[PDB]
From Swiss-Prot:
The gene is LYZ. The active site is at E35, D52. This is Lysozyme C. GO terms for molecular function: beta-N-acetylglucosaminidase activity; identical protein binding; lysozyme activity. Belongs to the glycosyl hydrolase 22 family. InterPro entries: Glyco_hydro_22, Glyco_hydro_22_CS, Glyco_hydro_22_lys, Lysozyme-like_dom_sf. The lineage of its organism: Eukaryota, Metazoa, Chordata, Craniata, Vertebrata. CDD domains: LYZ_C. In the egg white and polymorphonuclear leukocytes. Residues 1-129 form the C-type lysozyme domain. One of its GO terms (cellular component) is endoplasmic reticulum. Gene3D superfamilies: 1.10.530.10.
Length: 129
């Protein structure tokens, strides 16, 4: 599923991400825009052979099981394919665990490079929330 901007904001808000660990909604929508272009089916492969999955591009190296990343961990205890669903619940529950692990949203390279220190509120402007 390819989300609309305000559609995704509302979905995220309903799932408890607004201000989660101090990160306003605009931060999450910005990250999702640049990580996946709002597409739940996005996948990308890394040089070490791990793969990133879904709307927030969560990495099989630490967070999910895809059966082909030898020596990896599965800290959200889910199959990586669950992160590709049109229902974003699994992606969101796993993201909450990632952003809590000490490094906040810096775990998302596109957030660090393209959202951090910008006017992220602009990403939810106009939306009915
Ligand atoms: Cl933080
Ligand atoms: Na894994």
């Amino acid at each position: 599923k390819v989300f609309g901007r305000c559609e995704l904001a509302a979905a995220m808000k309903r799932h408890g991400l607004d201000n989660y660990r101090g990160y306003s909604l605009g931060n999450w929508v910005c990250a999702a825009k640049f990580e996946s272009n709002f597409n739940t089916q996005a996948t990308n492969r890394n040089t070490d052979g791990s793969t990133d999955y879904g709307i927030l591009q969560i990495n099989s190296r630490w967070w999910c099981n895809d059966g082909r990343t030898p020596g990896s961990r599965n800290l959200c205890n889910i199959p990586c394919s669950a992160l590709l669903s049109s229902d974003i619940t699994a992606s969101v529950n796993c993201a909450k665990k990632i952003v809590s692990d000490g490094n906040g949203m810096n775990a998302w390279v596109a957030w660090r490079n393209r959202c951090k220190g910008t006017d992220v509120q602009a990403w939810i402007r106009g939306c009915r929330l």
